[PDB]
Design a protein around this nucleic acid. Structure first.
Ligand SMILES: [Mg+2]
Ligand SMILES: [Mg+2]
Ligand SMILES: [Mg+2]
Ligand SMILES: [Mg+2]
Ligand SMILES: [Mg+2]
Ligand SMILES: [Mg+2]
Ligand SMILES: [Mg+2]
Ligand SMILES: [Mg+2]
Ligand SMILES: [Mg+2]
Ligand SMILES: [Mg+2]
Ligand SMILES: [Mg+2]
Ligand SMILES: [Mg+2]
Ligand SMILES: [Mg+2]
Ligand SMILES: [Mg+2]
Ligand SMILES: [Mg+2]
Ligand SMILES: [Mg+2]
Ligand SMILES: [Mg+2]
Ligand SMILES: [Mg+2]
Ligand SMILES: [Mg+2]
Ligand SMILES: [Mg+2]
Ligand SMILES: [Mg+2]
Ligand SMILES: [Mg+2]
Ligand SMILES: [Mg+2]
Ligand SMILES: [Mg+2]
Ligand SMILES: [Mg+2]
Ligand SMILES: [Mg+2]
Ligand SMILES: [Mg+2]
Ligand SMILES: [Mg+2]
Ligand SMILES: [Mg+2]
Lengths: 92, 53, 109, 44, 118
RNA sequence: AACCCACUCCCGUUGAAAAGGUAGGGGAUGACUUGUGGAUCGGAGUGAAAGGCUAAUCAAGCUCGGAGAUAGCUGGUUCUC
RNA sequence: AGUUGAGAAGCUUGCUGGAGGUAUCAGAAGUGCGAAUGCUGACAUGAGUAACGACAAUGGGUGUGAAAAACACCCACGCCGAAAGACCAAGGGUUCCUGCGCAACGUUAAUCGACGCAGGGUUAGUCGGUUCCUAAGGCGAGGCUGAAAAGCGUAGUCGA
């Protein structure tokens, strides 16, 4: 569809592991929609960044429960994906 | 066992009349003029005018 | 004269009376020495209060640290934190964790 | 010294679950009563 | 009853008591100054002094006997080479005990054990 | 021996534990022991049978209503002249 | 505090308090607590007493820090080793790692922590789920049975 391409990638994930992966390997870490599959997020990166991805690996991250006077509040859950590019191309 | 009547303020305070403190064994070092317990190394590390630590 | 307070101290009220009555009515020169070598926990707190009281007289007033004599010392009882402690055969007993208010007052007279 | 409550999830949901209560007539009345009281959970 | 009985238990079994002084002497003969408890120092002077006296005569049998009770190569090397020759003309009294305040956590009377010349 | 059970002494009784621990003890290829899932429920179930077990509660459970049951029986019933 | 009445009680003022109170006479009472092994919070005596949770075991040096028996490292001692060692399934639900800290807990102190604040950390065609099949058993179109709720049950589809 025309949509479902500007809704699967929620933005880059800045970290120390993600930064090291981008330099050592050609893997980039992204925050993806919780209902996004591996096919959608590989056809979205190649369309919105003009690159070629060999494969993508995804995981679901649970939200940390923070205790405050009023009850226990759960932070929003989210999905993470390691976009592994070809030896060429960079996901900037 | 247990008691039959509670102890009053006078009866309680009479028991703890023998509960006091005393540590007046202080001494002034001749050289440094530092107060310390007698027959003890001073807090700075002097004993009868001699550094030991 | 000037005073210094410690509203809220972990040690209980009763244990701190035995140090307060040991220095009530002495000079600050030896009051700091008695607590500098006392073996009880209350000595460290009470010396911290006494040195603050002496510093208050030194700064807010022109009183020298030599002529000061600790005049009035009284230890009141503060808020006690209540917590349970399990015991044998299911019974649970309540444990109070007491505090105290220490007020050391020094006078230059 | 085995105590009375040995936890499980598959047994808990098949007895005290929403589909266990909703299936029978009495359990639906329990759901209605618990909703009328206004409890936050309604399913334990 | 303790009538004329010498030696203090220190609330330790016999093997722990033996091994503790065996490891206090081996540590004292590396640093020559230890911050230890006063009752433990009053008993350490009945263990280190026999070793120092034994160190004044160098021999295979003496070195083996010393090793049998202070088992450490470094301590046996420190003996018979630095100690036992420095105190070659001092009759007894190879270390002193100096009380040093009290412990911070508990109230245990501490004491410094120091070799007499250093 | 693991595993299951609990015959004896002591400790513990406000215990480490609302039924345990150190010593000793019986079965240990079977009528065995045990993990997961399921069936039997209140004058009603299960029971190698003790009236035992049925969520620390059992000569018939727990909870909500009849219900503020009934009590010829205890206890209490507050200012003055 | 003083003062007036047989009493329940009433009147005037010092200080604190910082905004409402009701001569007198009539009504309407949730109308006067010392006790019910009375109900709910607070505080005592016991008492700074018993205990601080297996009788594997600790002793030095250095560092930090306001402060080291318990924090980190080194030397040396003891304990488990058919476990006090590793890996899965239940169950738990971020307790996992790094910085900033000890108001609280941890049966003591704490610079330490399964403790507070902020970040980071779980990557599957091949390992376990889902997807295929079914046991015990659950539900069950039609259909029989039952005052009503409902019970049984075939085809069928769920259940490791
Ligand atoms: Mg995955
Ligand atoms: Mg949410
Ligand atoms: Mg219990
Ligand atoms: Mg079941
Ligand atoms: Mg032995
Ligand atoms: Mg077992
Ligand atoms: Mg056996
Ligand atoms: Mg029972
Ligand atoms: Mg009644
Ligand atoms: Mg009736
Ligand atoms: Mg108004
Ligand atoms: Mg009334
Ligand atoms: Mg009352
Ligand atoms: Mg009490
Ligand atoms: Mg004590
Ligand atoms: Mg007593
Ligand atoms: Mg006693
Ligand atoms: Mg005791
Ligand atoms: Mg312990
Ligand atoms: Mg061994
Ligand atoms: Mg073995
Ligand atoms: Mg947490
Ligand atoms: Mg951690
Ligand atoms: Mg603490
Ligand atoms: Mg934490
Ligand atoms: Mg079937
Ligand atoms: Mg059926
Ligand atoms: Mg039908
Ligand atoms: Mg199937």
């Amino acid at each position: 569809n025309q949509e479902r391409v500007f809704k699967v990638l929620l933005g880059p994930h800045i970290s120390e592991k993600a930064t090291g992966l981008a330099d050592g390997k050609s893997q980039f870490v992204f925050k993806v929609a919780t209902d996004a599959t591996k096919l959608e997020i590989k056809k979205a990166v190649e369309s919105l960044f003009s690159v070629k991805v060999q494969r993508v690996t995804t995981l679901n991250v649970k939200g940390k429960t923070k205790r405050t006077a009023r009850g226990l509040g759960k932070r929003n859950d989210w999905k993470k994906a390691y976009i592994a590019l070809q030896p060429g191309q960079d996901l900037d | 066992a247990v008691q039959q009547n509670k102890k009053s303020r006078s009866a309680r305070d009479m028991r703890r009349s023998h509960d006091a403190l005393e540590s007046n064994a202080l001494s002034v070092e001749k050289s440094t003029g530092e107060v310390h317990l007698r027959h003890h190394v001073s807090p700075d590390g002097f004993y009868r005018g001699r550094k030991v630590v | 004269e000037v005073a210094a307070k410690l509203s809220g101290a972990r040690i209980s009220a009763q244990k701190a009376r035995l140090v307060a009555d040991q220095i009530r009515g002495k000079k600050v020169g030896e009051a700091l020495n008695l607590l500098a070598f006392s073996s009880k926990k209350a000595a460290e707190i009470m010396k911290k209060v006494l040195e603050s009281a002496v510093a208050n007289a030194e700064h807010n007033e022109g009183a020298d640290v030599d002529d000061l004599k600790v005049s009035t010392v009284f230890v009141n009882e503060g808020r006690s934190l209540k917590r349970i402690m399990p015991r044998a055969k299911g019974r649970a007993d309540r444990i109070v964790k007491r505090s105290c208010h220490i007020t050391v007052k020094v006078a230059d007279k | 010294m085995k105590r009375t409550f040995q936890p499980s999830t598959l047994k808990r949901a098949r007895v005290h679950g929403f589909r266990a209560r909703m299936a029978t007539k009495n359990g639906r009345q329990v759901l209605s009563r618990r909703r009328a009281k206004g409890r936050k959970r309604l399913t334990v | 009853m303790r009538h004329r009985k010498s030696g203090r238990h220190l609330s330790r079994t016999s093997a722990h008591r033996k091994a503790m002084f065996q490891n206090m002497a081996v540590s004292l003969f590396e640093h020559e100054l230890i911050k230890t408890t006063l009752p433990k120092a009053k008993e350490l002077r009945r263990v280190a002094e026999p070793l120092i006296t034994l160190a004044k005569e160098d021999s295979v049998a003496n070195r083996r006997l010393a090793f049998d009770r202070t088992r450490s190569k470094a301590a046996v090397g420190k003996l018979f080479n630095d100690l036992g020759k420095r105190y070659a003309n001092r009759p007894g009294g190879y270390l002193r005990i100096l009380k040093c305040g009290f412990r911070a956590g508990d109230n245990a009377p501490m004491a410094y054990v120091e070799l007499v010349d250093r």
